[PDB]
Amino acid sequence: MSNISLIVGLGNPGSEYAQTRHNAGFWFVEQLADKYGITLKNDPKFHGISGRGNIEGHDVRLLLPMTYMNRSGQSVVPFSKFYQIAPEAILIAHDELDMNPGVIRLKTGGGHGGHNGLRDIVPHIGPNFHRLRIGIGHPGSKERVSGHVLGKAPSNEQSLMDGAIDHALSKVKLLVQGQVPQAMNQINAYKPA
Amino acid sequence: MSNISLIVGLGNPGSEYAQTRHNAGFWFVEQLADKYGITLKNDPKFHGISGRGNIEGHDVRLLLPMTYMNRSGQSVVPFSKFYQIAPEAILIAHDELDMNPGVIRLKTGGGHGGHNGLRDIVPHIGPNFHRLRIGIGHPGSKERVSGHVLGKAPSNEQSLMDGAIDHALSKVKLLVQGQVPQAMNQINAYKPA
Numbered sequence: 001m002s003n004i005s006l007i008v009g010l011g012n013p014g015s016e017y018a019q020t021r022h023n024a025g026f027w028f029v030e031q032l033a034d035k036y037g038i039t040l041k042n043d044p045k046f047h048g049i050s051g052r053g054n055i056e057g058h059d060v061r062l063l064l065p066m067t068y069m070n071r072s073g074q075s076v077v078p079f080s081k082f083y084q085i086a087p088e089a090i091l092i093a094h095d096e097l098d099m100n101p102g103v104i105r106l107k108t109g110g111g112h113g114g115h116n117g118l119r120d121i122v123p124h125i126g127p128n129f130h131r132l133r134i135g136i137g138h139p140g141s142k143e144r145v146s147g148h149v150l151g152k153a154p155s156n157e158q159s160l161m162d163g164a165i166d167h168a169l170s171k172v173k174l175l176v177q178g179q180v181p182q183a184m185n186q187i188n189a190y191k192p193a
Numbered sequence: 194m195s196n197i198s199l200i201v202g203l204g205n206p207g208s209e210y211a212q213t214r215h216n217a218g219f220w221f222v223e224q225l226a227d228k229y230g231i232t233l234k235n236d237p238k239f240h241g242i243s244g245r246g247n248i249e250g251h252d253v254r255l256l257l258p259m260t261y262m263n264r265s266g267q268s269v270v271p272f273s274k275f276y277q278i279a280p281e282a283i284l285i286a287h288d289e290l291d292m293n294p295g296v297i298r299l300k301t302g303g304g305h306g307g308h309n310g311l312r313d314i315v316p317h318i319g320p321n322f323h324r325l326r327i328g329i330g331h332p333g334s335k336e337r338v339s340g341h342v343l344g345k346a347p348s349n350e351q352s353l354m355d356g357a358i359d360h361a362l363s364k365v366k367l368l369v370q371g372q373v374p375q376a377m378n379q380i381n382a383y384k385p386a
Contacts, residue, residue: 016339146209150343
Protein backbone atom coordinates (compact mmCIF):
# COMPACT_ATOMS: atom_id res chain seq x y z
CA MET A 1 0.00 0.00 0.00
CA SER A 2 0.97 3.53 1.22
CA ASN A 3 3.04 1.31 3.54
CA ILE A 4 6.66 0.87 2.45
CA SER A 5 7.14 -2.86 1.95
CA LEU A 6 10.50 -2.96 0.09
CA ILE A 7 13.61 -1.12 1.08
CA VAL A 8 16.47 -1.15 -1.48
CA GLY A 9 20.02 0.02 -0.80
CA LEU A 10 22.20 0.97 -3.76
CA GLY A 11 25.91 0.33 -3.93
CA ASN A 12 28.66 -1.81 -5.45
CA PRO A 13 29.54 -5.34 -4.25
CA GLY A 14 32.78 -6.40 -2.60
CA SER A 15 35.16 -5.31 0.04
CA GLU A 16 36.91 -2.91 -2.37
CA TYR A 17 33.75 -0.74 -2.51
CA ALA A 18 32.28 -1.25 0.97
CA GLN A 19 33.58 1.99 2.55
CA THR A 20 33.18 4.17 -0.53
CA ARG A 21 30.67 7.04 -0.65
CA HIS A 22 28.67 5.46 -3.46
CA ASN A 23 27.75 2.70 -0.98
CA ALA A 24 25.81 4.96 1.37
CA GLY A 25 22.59 3.12 0.50
CA PHE A 26 24.15 -0.22 1.42
CA TRP A 27 25.20 1.27 4.74
CA PHE A 28 21.63 2.24 5.54
CA VAL A 29 20.04 -1.06 4.56
CA GLU A 30 22.78 -3.23 6.27
CA GLN A 31 22.25 -1.27 9.42
CA LEU A 32 18.47 -1.49 9.18
CA ALA A 33 18.60 -5.26 8.61
CA ASP A 34 20.69 -5.84 11.68
CA LYS A 35 18.69 -3.40 13.85
CA TYR A 36 15.64 -5.62 13.31
CA GLY A 37 17.43 -8.95 13.13
CA ILE A 38 16.62 -9.52 9.49
CA THR A 39 19.11 -11.73 7.75
CA LEU A 40 20.44 -10.67 4.33
CA LYS A 41 21.06 -13.80 2.23
CA ASN A 42 22.48 -14.44 -1.22
CA ASP A 43 19.63 -14.23 -3.73
CA PRO A 44 21.14 -15.13 -7.11
CA LYS A 45 17.76 -15.39 -8.87
CA PHE A 46 17.47 -11.60 -8.50
CA HIS A 47 21.16 -10.78 -8.73
CA GLY A 48 21.24 -9.47 -5.17
CA ILE A 49 21.31 -10.10 -1.47
CA SER A 50 17.88 -10.00 0.14
CA GLY A 51 15.92 -10.59 3.29
CA ARG A 52 12.46 -10.33 4.80
CA GLY A 53 11.14 -9.84 8.31
CA ASN A 54 9.14 -7.87 10.75
CA ILE A 55 9.95 -4.19 11.09
CA GLU A 56 7.74 -2.40 13.66
CA GLY A 57 4.81 -4.80 13.04
CA HIS A 58 5.05 -4.96 9.25
CA ASP A 59 6.50 -7.59 6.90
CA VAL A 60 9.24 -5.79 4.93
CA ARG A 61 11.64 -6.99 2.24
CA LEU A 62 15.22 -5.69 2.07
CA LEU A 63 17.33 -5.80 -1.11
CA LEU A 64 20.95 -4.98 -2.01
CA PRO A 65 21.60 -5.36 -5.74
CA MET A 66 24.87 -7.21 -6.51
CA THR A 67 24.82 -6.04 -10.12
CA TYR A 68 27.17 -3.04 -9.63
CA MET A 69 25.62 0.40 -9.32
CA ASN A 70 24.85 1.18 -12.92
CA ARG A 71 23.06 -2.11 -13.46
CA SER A 72 20.89 -1.98 -10.29
CA GLY A 73 17.63 -2.29 -12.24
CA GLN A 74 18.67 -5.83 -13.19
CA SER A 75 17.93 -6.72 -9.57
CA VAL A 76 15.29 -4.17 -8.46
CA VAL A 77 12.99 -4.60 -11.44
CA PRO A 78 12.49 -8.38 -11.53
CA PHE A 79 12.50 -8.57 -7.73
CA SER A 80 9.73 -6.01 -7.37
CA LYS A 81 7.80 -7.58 -10.25
CA PHE A 82 8.06 -11.13 -8.85
CA TYR A 83 6.81 -10.05 -5.45
CA GLN A 84 4.23 -7.72 -7.01
CA ILE A 85 5.48 -4.68 -5.09
CA ALA A 86 4.32 -1.37 -6.53
CA PRO A 87 6.75 1.57 -6.79
CA GLU A 88 4.73 3.48 -4.30
CA ALA A 89 5.65 0.82 -1.68
CA ILE A 90 9.42 0.98 -2.48
CA LEU A 91 12.03 3.08 -0.69
CA ILE A 92 15.44 3.32 -2.39
CA ALA A 93 18.36 4.58 -0.29
CA HIS A 94 21.25 6.13 -2.18
CA ASP A 95 24.16 8.55 -2.04
CA GLU A 96 23.34 12.11 -3.01
CA LEU A 97 26.00 14.43 -4.46
CA ASP A 98 23.59 17.37 -4.23
CA MET A 99 23.42 17.28 -0.38
CA ASN A 100 26.26 17.65 2.09
CA PRO A 101 27.49 15.01 4.55
CA GLY A 102 25.13 15.14 7.52
CA VAL A 103 22.13 16.11 5.31
CA ILE A 104 19.46 13.52 4.59
CA ARG A 105 16.09 13.80 2.88
CA LEU A 106 13.17 11.69 1.84
CA LYS A 107 11.87 12.43 -1.67
CA THR A 108 8.96 10.98 -3.62
CA GLY A 109 9.03 10.83 -7.44
CA GLY A 110 11.18 12.84 -9.85
CA GLY A 111 14.14 11.75 -11.88
CA HIS A 112 17.61 10.28 -11.34
CA GLY A 113 19.43 13.57 -10.93
CA GLY A 114 22.43 12.12 -12.74
CA HIS A 115 22.67 9.17 -10.25
CA ASN A 116 23.52 6.21 -12.44
CA GLY A 117 21.93 3.66 -10.13
CA LEU A 118 18.56 5.45 -10.24
CA ARG A 119 19.09 5.90 -13.98
CA ASP A 120 18.93 2.15 -14.35
CA ILE A 121 15.67 1.86 -12.33
CA VAL A 122 13.40 4.77 -13.29
CA PRO A 123 12.94 3.59 -16.94
CA HIS A 124 11.46 0.30 -15.84
CA ILE A 125 9.30 0.94 -12.82
CA GLY A 126 8.73 4.67 -13.38
CA PRO A 127 9.58 7.47 -11.01
CA ASN A 128 6.95 7.09 -8.33
CA PHE A 129 9.05 5.33 -5.69
CA HIS A 130 10.43 6.97 -2.54
CA ARG A 131 14.11 7.83 -2.10
CA LEU A 132 16.25 8.27 0.96
CA ARG A 133 18.86 10.73 -0.31
CA ILE A 134 21.97 10.46 1.83
CA GLY A 135 24.20 13.46 1.35
CA ILE A 136 27.87 12.80 0.44
CA GLY A 137 28.83 16.31 -0.80
CA HIS A 138 29.83 17.40 -4.29
CA PRO A 139 33.55 17.82 -4.96
CA GLY A 140 33.02 20.88 -7.17
CA SER A 141 33.57 19.68 -10.78
CA LYS A 142 32.31 16.85 -12.99
CA GLU A 143 35.80 15.37 -13.41
CA ARG A 144 36.16 14.98 -9.63
CA VAL A 145 32.89 13.08 -9.18
CA SER A 146 34.25 9.58 -9.91
CA GLY A 147 37.05 9.72 -7.42
CA HIS A 148 34.69 11.19 -4.84
CA VAL A 149 31.98 8.52 -5.18
CA LEU A 150 34.53 5.72 -5.47
CA GLY A 151 36.50 7.13 -2.57
CA LYS A 152 36.40 6.70 1.15
CA ALA A 153 35.31 9.77 3.10
CA PRO A 154 37.58 11.22 5.74
CA SER A 155 36.45 10.42 9.27
CA ASN A 156 34.83 13.80 10.06
CA GLU A 157 32.61 13.52 6.95
CA GLN A 158 31.91 9.83 7.66
CA SER A 159 30.66 10.74 11.15
CA LEU A 160 28.29 13.33 9.68
CA MET A 161 26.89 10.72 7.21
CA ASP A 162 26.63 8.10 9.95
CA GLY A 163 24.67 10.45 12.19
CA ALA A 164 22.26 11.24 9.37
CA ILE A 165 21.78 7.50 8.67
CA ASP A 166 21.20 6.83 12.38
CA HIS A 167 18.48 9.46 12.37
CA ALA A 168 16.75 8.01 9.34
CA LEU A 169 16.89 4.53 10.86
CA SER A 170 14.90 5.92 13.78
CA LYS A 171 12.10 7.03 11.39
CA VAL A 172 11.65 3.74 9.55
CA LYS A 173 8.65 2.94 11.77
CA LEU A 174 6.79 5.86 10.22
CA LEU A 175 7.62 4.67 6.73
CA VAL A 176 6.60 1.03 7.14
CA GLN A 177 3.32 2.21 8.76
CA GLY A 178 2.46 4.34 5.77
CA GLN A 179 3.04 7.75 7.44
CA VAL A 180 5.16 9.12 4.67
CA PRO A 181 4.44 12.85 5.06
CA GLN A 182 5.36 12.65 8.75
CA ALA A 183 8.49 10.62 7.95
CA MET A 184 9.47 13.26 5.38
CA ASN A 185 9.07 16.10 7.81
CA GLN A 186 11.00 14.31 10.53
CA ILE A 187 13.81 13.01 8.36
CA ASN A 188 14.27 16.22 6.43
CA ALA A 189 14.54 18.31 9.63
CA TYR A 190 17.72 16.50 10.69
CA LYS A 191 20.77 18.58 11.47
CA PRO A 192 23.95 17.24 13.06
CA ALA A 193 23.99 17.79 16.81
CA MET B 194 49.34 -23.35 -30.75
CA SER B 195 52.13 -21.19 -29.33
CA ASN B 196 51.04 -18.23 -31.47
CA ILE B 197 48.83 -15.85 -29.46
CA SER B 198 45.35 -15.76 -30.98
CA LEU B 199 43.33 -14.00 -28.23
CA ILE B 200 44.31 -10.86 -26.44
CA VAL B 201 42.17 -9.87 -23.44
CA GLY B 202 42.34 -6.57 -21.64
CA LEU B 203 41.01 -6.36 -18.07
CA GLY B 204 39.20 -3.39 -16.65
CA ASN B 205 35.85 -1.92 -15.61
CA PRO B 206 33.20 -0.57 -18.00
CA GLY B 207 32.08 3.01 -18.28
CA SER B 208 33.47 6.48 -18.42
CA GLU B 209 33.71 6.69 -14.61
CA TYR B 210 36.43 3.96 -14.73
CA ALA B 211 38.11 4.63 -18.09
CA GLN B 212 41.06 6.61 -16.76
CA THR B 213 41.59 4.61 -13.59
CA ARG B 214 44.70 2.53 -12.98
CA HIS B 215 42.76 -0.72 -12.81
CA ASN B 216 41.94 -0.19 -16.51
CA ALA B 217 45.54 -0.44 -17.68
CA GLY B 218 44.62 -3.66 -19.56
CA PHE B 219 41.82 -1.89 -21.44
CA TRP B 220 44.33 0.81 -22.39
CA PHE B 221 46.63 -1.67 -24.00
CA VAL B 222 43.98 -3.57 -25.94
CA GLU B 223 42.08 -0.38 -27.08
CA GLN B 224 45.37 0.99 -28.36
CA LEU B 225 46.28 -2.30 -30.04
CA ALA B 226 42.88 -2.47 -31.75
CA ASP B 227 43.19 0.98 -33.22
CA LYS B 228 46.85 0.45 -34.23
CA TYR B 229 45.68 -2.38 -36.49
CA GLY B 230 42.30 -0.99 -37.47
CA ILE B 231 40.39 -3.67 -35.61
CA THR B 232 36.95 -2.55 -34.56
CA LEU B 233 35.80 -3.38 -31.02
CA LYS B 234 32.06 -4.05 -31.11
CA ASN B 235 29.46 -4.89 -28.52
CA ASP B 236 29.46 -8.63 -27.95
CA PRO B 237 26.58 -9.30 -25.48
CA LYS B 238 26.67 -13.08 -25.98
CA PHE B 239 30.07 -13.06 -24.18
CA HIS B 240 29.38 -10.14 -21.88
CA GLY B 241 32.08 -8.04 -23.51
CA ILE B 242 33.30 -5.92 -26.35
CA SER B 243 35.26 -7.87 -28.96
CA GLY B 244 36.92 -7.67 -32.31
CA ARG B 245 38.78 -9.73 -34.80
CA GLY B 246 41.26 -8.94 -37.54
CA ASN B 247 44.60 -9.16 -39.10
CA ILE B 248 47.59 -8.40 -36.90
CA GLU B 249 50.94 -8.87 -38.75
CA GLY B 250 49.44 -11.63 -40.97
CA HIS B 251 47.52 -13.50 -38.25
CA ASP B 252 43.80 -13.68 -37.46
CA VAL B 253 43.62 -12.42 -33.85
CA ARG B 254 40.67 -11.84 -31.57
CA LEU B 255 40.51 -9.01 -29.02
CA LEU B 256 38.26 -9.03 -25.94
CA LEU B 257 37.35 -6.49 -23.24
CA PRO B 258 35.07 -8.03 -20.62
CA MET B 259 32.16 -5.76 -19.63
CA THR B 260 31.44 -7.80 -16.52
CA TYR B 261 33.36 -5.52 -14.12
CA MET B 262 36.85 -6.60 -13.08
CA ASN B 263 36.05 -9.24 -10.48
CA ARG B 264 33.70 -11.07 -12.84
CA SER B 265 35.99 -11.12 -15.88
CA GLY B 266 35.85 -14.89 -16.16
CA GLN B 267 32.15 -14.59 -17.07
CA SER B 268 33.36 -13.21 -20.41
CA VAL B 269 36.80 -14.81 -20.91
CA VAL B 270 35.76 -18.38 -20.13
CA PRO B 271 32.78 -18.83 -22.52
CA PHE B 272 34.55 -16.79 -25.19
CA SER B 273 37.66 -18.96 -25.14
CA LYS B 274 35.52 -22.11 -24.96
CA PHE B 275 33.27 -21.13 -27.92
CA TYR B 276 36.23 -20.27 -30.14
CA GLN B 277 38.21 -23.29 -28.77
CA ILE B 278 41.19 -21.14 -27.80
CA ALA B 279 43.61 -22.95 -25.46
CA PRO B 280 45.19 -21.00 -22.55
CA GLU B 281 48.58 -21.13 -24.12
CA ALA B 282 47.23 -19.03 -27.05
CA ILE B 283 45.76 -16.31 -24.71
CA LEU B 284 47.46 -13.12 -23.57
CA ILE B 285 45.73 -11.20 -20.77
CA ALA B 286 46.85 -7.59 -20.16
CA HIS B 287 46.28 -6.23 -16.64
CA ASP B 288 47.38 -3.67 -14.08
CA GLU B 289 50.14 -4.78 -11.74
CA LEU B 290 50.45 -3.31 -8.23
CA ASP B 291 53.78 -5.04 -7.67
CA MET B 292 55.57 -3.17 -10.46
CA ASN B 293 56.17 0.52 -10.67
CA PRO B 294 54.74 2.79 -13.35
CA GLY B 295 56.89 2.39 -16.39
CA VAL B 296 57.71 -1.26 -15.67
CA ILE B 297 56.09 -3.91 -17.89
CA ARG B 298 56.59 -7.64 -18.08
CA LEU B 299 55.37 -10.65 -19.96
CA LYS B 300 54.80 -13.68 -17.71
CA THR B 301 53.61 -17.18 -18.46
CA GLY B 302 51.68 -19.20 -15.85
CA GLY B 303 51.64 -18.69 -12.07
CA GLY B 304 48.75 -17.48 -9.96
CA HIS B 305 46.67 -14.29 -9.64
CA GLY B 306 48.98 -12.53 -7.24
CA GLY B 307 45.95 -11.06 -5.47
CA HIS B 308 44.60 -9.47 -8.70
CA ASN B 309 40.86 -9.99 -8.48
CA GLY B 310 40.36 -10.08 -12.24
CA LEU B 311 42.85 -12.91 -12.68
CA ARG B 312 41.31 -14.55 -9.60
CA ASP B 313 38.11 -14.94 -11.60
CA ILE B 314 39.88 -16.54 -14.59
CA VAL B 315 42.53 -18.92 -13.27
CA PRO B 316 40.00 -21.34 -11.63
CA HIS B 317 38.31 -21.98 -14.98
CA ILE B 318 40.96 -22.07 -17.63
CA GLY B 319 43.94 -22.81 -15.39
CA PRO B 320 47.05 -20.75 -15.01
CA ASN B 321 48.86 -21.50 -18.29
CA PHE B 322 47.98 -18.32 -20.18
CA HIS B 323 50.33 -15.42 -20.79
CA ARG B 324 50.04 -12.11 -18.94
CA LEU B 325 51.10 -8.61 -19.83
CA ARG B 326 51.72 -7.10 -16.38
CA ILE B 327 51.47 -3.31 -16.62
CA GLY B 328 53.03 -1.67 -13.58
CA ILE B 329 50.82 0.81 -11.72
CA GLY B 330 52.75 1.07 -8.42
CA HIS B 331 51.65 0.13 -4.94
CA PRO B 332 50.32 2.77 -2.50
CA GLY B 333 52.05 1.15 0.48
CA SER B 334 49.24 -0.55 2.48
CA LYS B 335 46.35 -2.93 1.83
CA GLU B 336 43.70 -0.37 2.83
CA ARG B 337 45.01 2.14 0.28
CA VAL B 338 44.84 -0.32 -2.64
CA SER B 339 41.19 0.35 -3.58
CA GLY B 340 41.56 4.06 -3.88
CA HIS B 341 44.75 3.58 -5.88
CA VAL B 342 43.35 1.16 -8.43
CA LEU B 343 40.07 3.06 -8.69
CA GLY B 344 41.94 6.34 -9.02
CA LYS B 345 43.43 8.27 -11.87
CA ALA B 346 47.21 8.47 -11.94
CA PRO B 347 48.93 11.85 -11.90
CA SER B 348 50.44 12.86 -15.20
CA ASN B 349 54.05 11.89 -14.43
CA GLU B 350 52.96 8.33 -13.57
CA GLN B 351 50.61 8.20 -16.57
CA SER B 352 53.51 9.11 -18.89
CA LEU B 353 55.64 6.30 -17.50
CA MET B 354 52.76 3.75 -17.97
CA ASP B 355 51.96 5.01 -21.47
CA GLY B 356 55.59 4.62 -22.57
CA ALA B 357 55.66 1.06 -21.24
CA ILE B 358 52.42 0.24 -23.08
CA ASP B 359 53.77 1.75 -26.31
CA HIS B 360 56.84 -0.47 -25.99
CA ALA B 361 54.70 -3.59 -25.51
CA LEU B 362 52.58 -2.67 -28.50
CA SER B 363 55.75 -2.65 -30.58
CA LYS B 364 56.37 -6.34 -29.62
CA VAL B 365 52.92 -7.71 -30.46
CA LYS B 366 54.22 -8.91 -33.82
CA LEU B 367 56.54 -11.36 -32.01
CA LEU B 368 53.65 -12.65 -29.89
CA VAL B 369 51.13 -13.27 -32.67
CA GLN B 370 53.88 -14.90 -34.82
CA GLY B 371 54.59 -17.45 -32.05
CA GLN B 372 57.96 -16.05 -30.90
CA VAL B 373 57.01 -15.82 -27.27
CA PRO B 374 60.44 -16.26 -25.66
CA GLN B 375 61.80 -13.42 -27.90
CA ALA B 376 58.75 -11.24 -27.03
CA MET B 377 59.42 -11.91 -23.38
CA ASN B 378 63.04 -10.92 -23.58
CA GLN B 379 62.28 -7.75 -25.58
CA ILE B 380 59.29 -6.62 -23.53
CA ASN B 381 60.93 -7.31 -20.20
CA ALA B 382 64.07 -5.35 -21.09
CA TYR B 383 62.08 -2.08 -21.26
CA LYS B 384 63.56 0.68 -19.16
CA PRO B 385 61.32 3.65 -18.42
CA ALA B 386 64.33 5.74 -17.27
